[PDB]
Structures are given as C-alpha cells and as structure tokens.
C-alpha cells in the first residue's frame, strides 16, 4: 500500500510504480526510473547483501 495506510484506509499501488513517486519528491522526474529499472534492482538487491 506504499504509505497511505498511515493516514486512513490502505490503497494498493504496484511496487514499480511506487518508486517513481519517491523520486518525484526528491526532485528528479519519474521517467528516469523506468529507463533504468533493471540495474537499480541489481544495485538495490546487492546492497543489502
């Protein structure tokens, strides 16, 4: 549900779509995420290792 469950009812969002919203608040457009989806997943998944 992302973060909407901290203000009332919980609403579902695809996880790929949700990460675009976080980049939107940072200051970078959401388009850059989809153009680099594959390497980010490898970068993030190996980060926790």
């Amino acid at each position: 549900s992302g973060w909407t469950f901290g203000a009332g009812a919980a609403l579902q969002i695809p996880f790929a779509m949700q990460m675009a919203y976080r980049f939107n608040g940072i200051g970078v457009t959401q388009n850059v995420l989809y153009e680099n989806q594959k390497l980010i997943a490898n970068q993030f998944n190996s980060a926790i290792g």
Binding site: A16, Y34, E35, Q37
Partner: protein, 35 residues
Amino acid sequence: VVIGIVNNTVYDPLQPELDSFKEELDKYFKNHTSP
C-alpha cells in the same frame, strides 16, 4: 524500453488548435481552391 506500456491515442491540446483550425483552414482552402 519502458516495461508494461500500453497502447492508446494521445490528444494534443493543440489539436483544438490544429485539428479544429486546420479544418477551418481546410474549410477556407476548399472555398479558396474552388475558383
């Protein structure tokens, strides 16, 4: 490259500036090319 994209037609806000005025220009041109 974008995964999960879908097919549909997008509308330019300038289609009412082109599709609705190119037709007026066509409407004039048909009245203009007839003579």
